[PDB]
Amino acid sequence: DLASLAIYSFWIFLAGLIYYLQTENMREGYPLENEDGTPAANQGPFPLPKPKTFILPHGRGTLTVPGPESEDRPIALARTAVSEGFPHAPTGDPMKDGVGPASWVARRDLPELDGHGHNKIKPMKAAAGFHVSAGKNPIGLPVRGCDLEIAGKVVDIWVDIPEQMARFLEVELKDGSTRLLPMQMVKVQSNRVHVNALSSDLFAGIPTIKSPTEVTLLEEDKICGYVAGGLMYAAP
Amino acid sequence: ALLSFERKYRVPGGTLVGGNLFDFWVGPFYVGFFGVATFFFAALGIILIAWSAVLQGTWNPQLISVYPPALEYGLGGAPLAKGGLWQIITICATGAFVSWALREVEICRKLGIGYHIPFAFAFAILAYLTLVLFRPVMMGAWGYAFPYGIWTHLDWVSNTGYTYGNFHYNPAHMIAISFFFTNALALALHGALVLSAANPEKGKEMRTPDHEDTFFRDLVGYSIGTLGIHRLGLLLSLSAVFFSALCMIITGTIWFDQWVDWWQWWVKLPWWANIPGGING
Amino acid sequence: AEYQNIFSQVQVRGPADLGMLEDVNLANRSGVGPFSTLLGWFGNAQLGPIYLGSLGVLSLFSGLMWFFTIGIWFWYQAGWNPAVFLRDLFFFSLEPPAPEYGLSFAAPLKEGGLWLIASFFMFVAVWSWWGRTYLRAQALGMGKHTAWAFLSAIWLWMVLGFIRPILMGSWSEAVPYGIFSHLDWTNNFSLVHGNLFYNPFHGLSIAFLYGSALLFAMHGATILAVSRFGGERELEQIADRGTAAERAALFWRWTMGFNATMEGIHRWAIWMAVLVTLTGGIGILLSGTVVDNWYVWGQNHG
Ligand code: BCL
Numbered sequence: 014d015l016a017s018l019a020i021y022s023f024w025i026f027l028a029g030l031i032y033y034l035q036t037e038n039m040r041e042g043y044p045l046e047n048e049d050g051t052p053a054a055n056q057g058p059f060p061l062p063k064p065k066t067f068i069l070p071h072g073r074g075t076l077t078v079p080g081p082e083s084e085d086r087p088i089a090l091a092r093t094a095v096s097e098g099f100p101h102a103p104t105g106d107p108m109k110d111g112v113g114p115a116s117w118v119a120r121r122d123l124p125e126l127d128g129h130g131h132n133k134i135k136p137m138k139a140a141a142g143f144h145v146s147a148g149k150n151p152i153g154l155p156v157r158g159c160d161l162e163i164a165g166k167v168v169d170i171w172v173d174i175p176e177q178m179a180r181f182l183e184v185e186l187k188d189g190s191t192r193l194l195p196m197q198m199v200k201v202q203s204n205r206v207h208v209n210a211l212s213s214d215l216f217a218g219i220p221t222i223k224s225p226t227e228v229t230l231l232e233e234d235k236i237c238g239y240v241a242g243g244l245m246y247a248a249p
Numbered sequence: 250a251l252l253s254f255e256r257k258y259r260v261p262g263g264t265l266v267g268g269n270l271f272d273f274w275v276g277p278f279y280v281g282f283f284g285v286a287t288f289f290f291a292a293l294g295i296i297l298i299a300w301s302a303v304l305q306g307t308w309n310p311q312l313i314s315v316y317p318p319a320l321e322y323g324l325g326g327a328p329l330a331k332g333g334l335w336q337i338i339t340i341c342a343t344g345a346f347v348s349w350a351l352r353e354v355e356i357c358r359k360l361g362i363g364y365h366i367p368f369a370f371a372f373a374i375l376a377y378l379t380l381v382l383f384r385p386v387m388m389g390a391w392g393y394a395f396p397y398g399i400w401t402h403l404d405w406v407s408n409t410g411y412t413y414g415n416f417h418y419n420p421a422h423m424i425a426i427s428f429f430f431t432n433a434l435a436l437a438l439h440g441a442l443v444l445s446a447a448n449p450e451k452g453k454e455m456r457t458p459d460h461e462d463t464f465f466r467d468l469v470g471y472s473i474g475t476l477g478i479h480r481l482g483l484l485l486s487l488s489a490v491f492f493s494a495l496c497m498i499i500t501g502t503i504w505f506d507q508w509v510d511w512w513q514w515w516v517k518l519p520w521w522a523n524i525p526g527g528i529n530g
Numbered sequence: 531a532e533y534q535n536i537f538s539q540v541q542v543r544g545p546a547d548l549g550m551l552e553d554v555n556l557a558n559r560s561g562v563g564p565f566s567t568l569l570g571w572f573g574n575a576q577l578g579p580i581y582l583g584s585l586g587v588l589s590l591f592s593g594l595m596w597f598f599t600i601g602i603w604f605w606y607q608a609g610w611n612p613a614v615f616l617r618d619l620f621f622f623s624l625e626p627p628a629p630e631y632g633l634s635f636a637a638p639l640k641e642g643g644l645w646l647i648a649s650f651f652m653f654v655a656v657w658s659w660w661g662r663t664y665l666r667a668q669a670l671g672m673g674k675h676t677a678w679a680f681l682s683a684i685w686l687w688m689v690l691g692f693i694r695p696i697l698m699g700s701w702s703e704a705v706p707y708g709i710f711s712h713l714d715w716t717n718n719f720s721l722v723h724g725n726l727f728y729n730p731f732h733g734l735s736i737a738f739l740y741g742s743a744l745l746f747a748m749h750g751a752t753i754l755a756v757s758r759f760g761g762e763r764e765l766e767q768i769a770d771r772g773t774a775a776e777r778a779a780l781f782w783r784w785t786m787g788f789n790a791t792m793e794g795i796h797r798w799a800i801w802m803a804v805l806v807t808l809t810g811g812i813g814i815l816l817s818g819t820v821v822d823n824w825y826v827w828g829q830n831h832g
Pocket residue numbers: 417422423424426427428430431687690705709710712713716
């Protein structure tokens with residue numbers, strides 16, 4: 014009968030769909046490797062999918078996945094066991110080197126652009142029309158670290174133009190230079206900004222940006238990675 | 250056994266218990282102390298369901314079913330052959346769920362991310378405990394809990410619901426269905442949006458989040474935003490389950506009559522409680 | 531306490547955004563609406579503009595007519611008594627024509643005619659809106675994903691009040707317009723077909739409904755878990771993978787030994803949701819036409 018036919022046909026379909034879904038999710042990170050960087054023996058039941066290409070806007074070129082997977086950077090880590098499956102220890106300074114929770118990716122060293130081709134993120138002092146419309150304005154507040162010591166003061170807010178969002182807080186340090194702090198990692202209070210992931214002595218170590226009126230995807234990743242990493246390594 | 254970009258993340262640290270005794274992986278799985286605990290509870294619990302299969306006299310997955318103690322046992326312990334096995338398994342079930350949650354917290358501390366995931370999971374655990382623990386204790390017997398069986402647990406849903414007429418009238422049930430119905434709509438949209446922008450018409454350049462916001466404004470006059478839609482999704486979900494737990498914590502305790510009758514408070518409001526004509530006059 | 535990012539700590543506002551242009555007929559866009567500080571704590575504060583145009587106005591008009599038509603009937607029944615109308619708002623109901631009338635448009639108003647009228651409007655209201663979500667994507671040059679997903683919802687809707695009633699032979703098998711009213715219809719439908727829990731498509735639909743809640747709970751929590759590395763900027767993370775996509779994928783791989791990609795998870799998402807009404811529509815279409823009692827059917831598959 015139809016009912017019995019329809020329900021079997023459905024399971025066949027569902028089997029094909031899960032096959033399509035799983036392979037689509039293999040466009041990044043594959044093939045699997047051994048802890049030494051070499052291709053693993055067992056790659057699993059599903060095969061890599063036929064490559065697809067994205068045409069990036071604003072003349073940024075194209076992208077094709079799956080494709081050549083390379084960290085394009087040195088990983089300061091070493092084995093702690095003679096067998097597979099154990100922790101890899103930081104050979105130097107985890108914060109400085111950028112491994113573990115403080116890891117970053119080698120994203121393009123260009124800024125994200127909006128629909129018209131203009132930098133997506135900009136400090137407010139350079140964003141025409143933008144202002145703080147609700148909540149406590151942080152500009153001018155002193156910044157405290159997880160060690161309860163003051164590390165600086167906020168001098169500006171970096172905002173997302175097309176999505177009208179505060180993404181970064183620009184902070185001035187004791188030596189007169191600035192740094193960026195992820196909006197999502199700070200706690201704005203009545204008379205101060207609290208940064209629990211970093212202690213006063215680690216703010217200078219935050220990676221800096223080259224241009225003073227724009228951040229690149231690569232710089233954002235280094236900045237964010239570094240600050241999140243403080244949650245584990247800054248405990249001391 | 251590793252994703253191309255995985256090694257840099259596999260560092261020591263983040264564990265809540267045992268220091269580094271269980272700080273290692275098995276294939277793609279992270280272990281941890283709680284990794285071992287959930288294995289303990291799960292095997293034990295599985296074994297017990299197998300011993301329940303023998304006593305019942307069947308190996309058919311569609312027939313096997315572990316029942317809770319009969320009401321005559323109240324909240325006390327009962328013989329394995331009749332409710333004991335169910336009580337023990339529920340402890341193992343509970344032990345495996347919580348352990349899984351805490352294992353997530355550890356994976357969380359190692360990766361340096363937020364705790365949103367284990368937090369969201371805890372709401373499902375709360376729903377489970379409401380049906381096999383909180384409600385039963387408030388009613389006075391393990392007998393009100395649900396059985397563990399593919400079809401026998403559906404019967405329970407059907408018989409429990411009908412014990413109060415049409416369960417559709419449970420007011421917290423109505424709210425809860427709204428969040429479930431809405432969460433799905435929101436998921437279909439979010440998914441379709443992100444995909445129509447990343448996979449535009451053949452030959453065209455990859456659209457931007459601006460096109461995503463423009464598309465929705467043109468359509469319904471408002472866009473919640475890339476960050477807003479993820480906050481919304483988390484919320485609709487946890488809300489659907491929070492009200493589910495609620496519609497049931499109040500059924501059999503503070504209200505035990507027909508749910509449809511509960512609606513008379515509204516119609517009996519003095520002002521119109523007697524005016525003629527209509528449906529209730 | 532560390533910031534969780536459910537509500538913004540600070541709102542920032544700039545000039546109203548008139549959105550992208552592409553091939554959109556700018557002559558059809560209204561003007562920016564006001565800015566909502568209330569909404570801005572959770573997401574975008576900008577209301578409007580909106581794009582109307584032919585199809586847009588046809589639906590909105592057709593839609594209100596379906597709405598008013600019903601409301602006329604509610605008042606009739608409430609005897610034009612405002613207090614009554616309110617007391618029994620959830621109880622009123624516009625029922626379809628009786629079995630006798632079959633599938634003709636001859637039944638009298640007070641016997642099913644108004645229903646047929648109200649339906650006709652809702653039928654125009656919905657289909658024109660569908661064309662609207664297709665056209666609005668075309669103008670901007672985006673994929674038609676939203677339109678196709680929405681079709682799946684129309685499917686179940688179409689099956690409940692149009693396709694099944696026809697195949698059955700009378701507008702009688704359709705659903706009534708009323709709050710409590712359509713709840714009873716639903717409960718009934720189940721009883722008359724020997725318990726829907728025995729319908730396999732019903733149980734599948736539920737799996738996907740529960741699955742949709744699990745997934746969005748999973749997906750949303752994750753993006754907020756890695757929003758500290760710019761994770762919500764999903765489109766650019768697809769074109770140029772960052773730590774957000776890596777930690778997001780590794781969290782789940784370490785948890786359940788398998789994972790998704792920034793683009794992939796959205797394919798899981800659109801399908802988990804879409805299948806709810808896809809599987810549902812089928813289960814309902816076969817009820818009463820091919821299978822009379824699902825219990826009996828579950829005994830002998832045929
Ligand atoms: C799937 C099987 C059944 C069915 C079973 C159920 C069940 C079971 C329940 C509902 C419920 C609802 N159903 Mg139904 N429903 C069916 C088909 C439909 C169709 C249709 C075109 O086929 C429609 C429009 C609806 C619509 C609705 C909503 C009125 C209500 C859910 C809220 C929600 O989240 O909506 C999703 C939509 C949005 C988020 C957008 C629009 C929001 C609307 C306008 C809000 C209306 C609020 C209402 C007027 C409250 C006033 C309160 C005052 C104090 C008086 N159903 C089919 C036939 N429906 C729930 C309920 O509470 O009912 C009373 C409920 O428990």
